[PDB]
Amino acid sequence: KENALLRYLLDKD
Amino acid sequence: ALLRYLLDKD
Amino acid sequence: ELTPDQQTLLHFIMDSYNKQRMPQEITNKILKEAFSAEENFLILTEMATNHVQVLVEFTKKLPGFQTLDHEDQIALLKGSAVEAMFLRSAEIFNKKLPSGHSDLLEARIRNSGISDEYITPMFSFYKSIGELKMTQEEYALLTAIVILSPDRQYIKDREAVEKLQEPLLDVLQKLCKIHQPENPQHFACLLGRLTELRTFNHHHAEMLMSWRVNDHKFTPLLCEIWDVQ
Amino acid sequence: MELTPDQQTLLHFIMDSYNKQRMPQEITNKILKEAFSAEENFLILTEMATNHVQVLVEFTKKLPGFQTLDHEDQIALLKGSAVEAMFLRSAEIFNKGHSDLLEARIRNSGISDEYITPMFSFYKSIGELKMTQEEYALLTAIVILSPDRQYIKDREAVEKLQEPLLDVLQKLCKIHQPENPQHFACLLGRLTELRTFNHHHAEMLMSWRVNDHKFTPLLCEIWD
Ligand SMILES: CC[C@H]1[C@@H](O)[C@@H]2[C@H](CC[C@]3(C)[C@@H]([C@H](C)CCNC(=O)NS(=O)(=O)c4ccccc4)CC[C@@H]23)[C@@]2(C)CC[C@@H](O)[C@H](F)[C@@H]12
Ligand SMILES: CC[C@H]1[C@@H](O)[C@@H]2[C@H](CC[C@]3(C)[C@@H]([C@H](C)CCNC(=O)NS(=O)(=O)c4ccccc4)CC[C@@H]23)[C@@]2(C)CC[C@@H](O)[C@H](F)[C@@H]12
């Protein structure tokens, strides 16, 4: 599903 | 081989 | 022969590439911590995790990338995460044999529960790209080219990605023709080692369905990005 | 079917004299220390080699009855054995600890990767047998005292020297693994396998070299 760890990882500033 | 001039001793 | 807007691309990427080294923390472990599979497996995973962060920070910095569909970036990094790792592993093995670490790195991979059948090719491969004797500059782009590989699985818009790739491919195009004029096959033999790398994807992912130590488990980021089990 | 006291005493002779012979920690420190240069690797190894040979000779000289051998046959035995003798200490060391760097030093010491890989694959295989430090002692003593070396004037005399050491082994394979019977020949065949790897060892020494150094005095006594 939504692999969020990576979403966050790049979404972070 | 040739003369393996090697003392065992010690 | 490298337009000035290319020398701007190149300069940046080397800033992009080196800015993120990895902790001296998890490095005094390589050259000191003791030697069991229990121990070694933990070091490597922890590094692997560490380097996905280095790999995303870089990816983040790459030209344009940021604009691409948010739900694509994820698709591009869930792809290269592995393959780019193999490019790193080369930079530190066939290149760069210092006196500090690196061989004590190979040491721990030898006793990591990783299966010899899986290893002795992967290393005989590190020999192969060794024989090219590549540039830090040469690895630098490669890695970027791979982050930006137009048709990873499940991409929204390829052209958008191709777009971003081309300026990098055409530098390294010239860079090869310039810094190595002797045989022009080279550039294609570089691109070929990329293809030679997407074949290492399957072999890797199969190995995961077997790597196991004293009831240890993989870091959660790792599992996510190597789609483990 | 346990062992006798006589056999039990040779065994504890062999160990005590096998294990007594240590290698000098000055180097044992060096392996877990010195720089990782192609060159420094090779120096660190020829040390290990030469230092080992000395230990060998010491070990042979303790072996019961060796005393009693035509000196031209003492020589002949130690040159024949020594290589193979080292292959066993090697196989002992590389599947025991917290010093894997010996493997590491070798995988950057000027030896070809085509030579290196089989040797370890063989070393791993002999790991599988999983062998009591006892068994390595006896198997070494047997390789040493091996009558069929070239230039070995009076055999027989050697046969009769090696016979106790075998005999003791044949019991252990009963009195420790009566599961598979054809074990004794399991070992005695792995033995025979090692007597090949030294012709391959040979053809390496010719190739081998790093920043053109040179071999220690004793170790040159094999070949040129
Ligand atoms: C070939 C087997 C071996 C090898 O690929 C391993 C890999 C895990 C990730 C590693 C460990 C890579 C690290 C994370 C590289 C990035 N870190 C880093 O660079 N720190 S560093 O810059 O401070 C440094 C520099 C120089 C020396 C020491 C440390 C290089 C070798 C890479 C595997 C174990 C499992 C997966 C399987 O696919 C692969 F086959 C395996
Ligand atoms: C396969 C490649 C590799 C390996 O066999 C090497 C061998 C040199 C002699 C070594 C170095 C042997 C030493 C002399 C054994 C005696 N030392 C010793 O016992 N130290 S120790 O007891 O302080 C100790 C204890 C525990 C861990 C570490 C050290 C073991 C590995 C042996 C070769 C480089 C060249 C020729 C080729 O045939 C052999 F194939 C090569």
- Strand and helix order of chain A: H
Q: Give Rg of chain A in angstroms.
A: 7 Å
Q: Any idea what the shape of chain A is?
A: elongated
Q: Work out the helix count of chain C.
A: 9
PDB class: nuclear protein
Keywords: nuclear receptor, ligand binding domain, nuclear protein
Assembly: tetrameric
Entry title: Steroidal Selective Modulators of FXR with Therapeutic Potential
Descriptive labels:
heterotetramer, A: 13 residues, mainly alpha, 1 helix, 62% helix, 0% strand, C: 229 residues, Retinoid X Receptor, binds ligand RJC, Bile acid receptor (chain C), Nuclear receptor coactivator 2 (chain B)
Structure description:
The complex is a heterotetramer, with two copies of chain A and two copies of chain C. By secondary structure, chain A is mainly alpha-helical. Chain A has one helix at 4-11. In chain A, 8% of the residues are buried. Helix content of chain A is 62%, strand content 0%. Chain C has 229 residues and is mainly alpha-helical. Chain C has one domain (1-227): Retinoid X Receptor, CATH 1.10.565. Chain C has nine helices and no strands. Chain C has helices at 4-18, 37-61, 70-93, 103-110, 116-132, 136-147, 158-179, 185-208, 220-225. Chains in contact: A-C, B-D, C-D. Chain C binds chain D through residues 34-36, 97-100, 102-104, 106-108, 110-111, 116, 120, 124, 127, and chain D through 35-37, 97-101, 103-104, 107-108, 113, 117, 124. The complex binds ligand RJC (2 copies). One ligand RJC binds at residues 23, 28, 45, 48-49, 52, 86, 89-90, 93, 99, 102, 106, 116, 119-120, 201 of chain D. Chain B: A motif (LXXLL motif 3) lies at residues 3-7. Chain B: This is Nuclear receptor coactivator 2. Chain B: It is found in: Nucleus. Chain B: Belongs to the SRC/p160 nuclear receptor coactivator family. Chain D: Its main location: nucleus.
